[PDB]
């Protein structure tokens, strides 16, 4: 009986530890959600610079087509 009183005290300490672990795991997952948001923002910035490469790539090809002229209308696209 008194030994079992000490046993339940051990279990009390264990439960306190477990509660802290549970709280920490919840906080961990919360941080993962926040992390995912920031990573999405990063990818957005990368997409922006991909747009920049699209600009210069079209520039280069447009010039090369004019530069490679070795033997029209004005219809273009103006968003």
């Amino acid at each position: 009986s008194p030994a079992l009183l000490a046993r339940v005290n051990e279990k009390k300490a264990e439960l306190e530890n477990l509660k802290e672990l549970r709280d920490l795991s919840a906080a961990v997952a919360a941080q993962m959600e926040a992390l995912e948001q920031k990573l999405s923002t990063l990818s957005s910035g990368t997409e922006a610079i991909a747009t920049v490469l699209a600009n210069w790539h079209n520039v280069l090809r447009a010039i090369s087509m004019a530069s490679a002229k070795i033997p029209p209308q004005t219809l273009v696209r103006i968003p």
Binding site: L60, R61, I63, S64, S67, A68
Partner: protein
């Protein structure tokens, strides 16, 4: 030899204007050489954008 005397005086006049022009071109030629000497900064620069136009017909 009256016309020969005229020939002598006139060829000397020609020599005067001749040498005058020589001195003119000499000071000018110094200007020319100085100009190109200041302008020789176009070797690597031209080579750089030569590589630019070279890579235009590369990709």
């Amino acid at each position: 030899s009256y016309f020969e005397q005229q020939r002598q005086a006139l060829i000397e006049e020609i020599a005067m204007n001749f040498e005058h022009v020589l001195a003119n071109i000499n000071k000018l030629n110094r200007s020319l050489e100085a100009v190109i000497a200041v302008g020789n900064e176009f070797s690597s620069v031209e080579a750089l954008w030569s590589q630019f136009e070279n890579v235009m017909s590369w990709s």
